């Protein structure tokens, strides 16, 4: 039921907060990749694969072909499929428990999907732009 306040930065996390799977997929796309490259491939992925139920059943080679030439597309395709499967079948409390979700994905989830932002200390440039803005404006 948590609604993260809307910032002037319009991070992709702010668009996808309502669907934790979509937000976490966005972190897999954005992790060690520029937004200019990641963002359009991200929407094309979500358009063909709108849910974890659809992504977990895919052949990674077909996901990979869509992801080309985004850096390390084969690894990323395999990560997306195994993560989508774990997302559904595991009784996880935090996404850090899932395959392919590191501190960056967990910080994004704890800022946007659950109301734990005050306890989060991000290391990502964009997350910190949002997080710092939210520290300055939360009472207003």
Curated annotation (Swiss-Prot):
Species of provenance: Homo sapiens
Complete-protein stretch covered: 437 to 576 of 580
Residues annotated as catalytic: 124
Subunit structure: Interacts with MLH1.
Transmembrane region(s): none
UniProt superkingdom: Eukaryota
Compartments where found: Nucleus
Illness the protein is tied to: Tumor predisposition syndrome 2: An autosomal recessive condition characterized by predisposition to develop a variety of tumors or malignancies, including acute myeloid leukemia, myelodysplastic syndrome, colorectal adenomatous polyposis and carcinoma, and uveal melanoma.
Name this polypeptide is given: Methyl-CpG-binding domain protein 4
Function: Mismatch-specific DNA N-glycosylase involved in DNA repair. Has thymine glycosylase activity and is specific for G:T mismatches within methylated and unmethylated CpG sites. Can also remove uracil or 5-fluorouracil in G:U mismatches. Has no lyase activity. Was first identified as methyl-CpG-binding protein.
């Amino acid at each position: 039921k948590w609604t993260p306040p809307r910032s002037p930065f319009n991070l992709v996390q702010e668009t996808l907060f309502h669907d934790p799977w979509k937000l976490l997929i966005a972190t897999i796309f954005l992790n060690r990749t520029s937004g200019k490259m990641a963002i359009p491939v991200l929407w094309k992925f979500l358009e063909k694969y709108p849910s974890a139920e659809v992504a977990r059943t895919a052949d990674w080679r077909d996901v990979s072909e869509l992801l080309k030439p985004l850096g390390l597309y084969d690894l990323r395709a395999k990560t997306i499929v195994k993560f989508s499967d774990e997302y559904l079948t595991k009784q996880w409390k935090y996404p850090i428990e899932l395959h392919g979700i590191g501190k960056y994905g967990n910080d994004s989830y704890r800022i946007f999907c659950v109301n734990e932002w005050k306890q989060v200390h991000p290391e990502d440039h964009k997350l910190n732009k949002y997080h710092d803005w939210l520290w300055e404006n939360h009472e207003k």
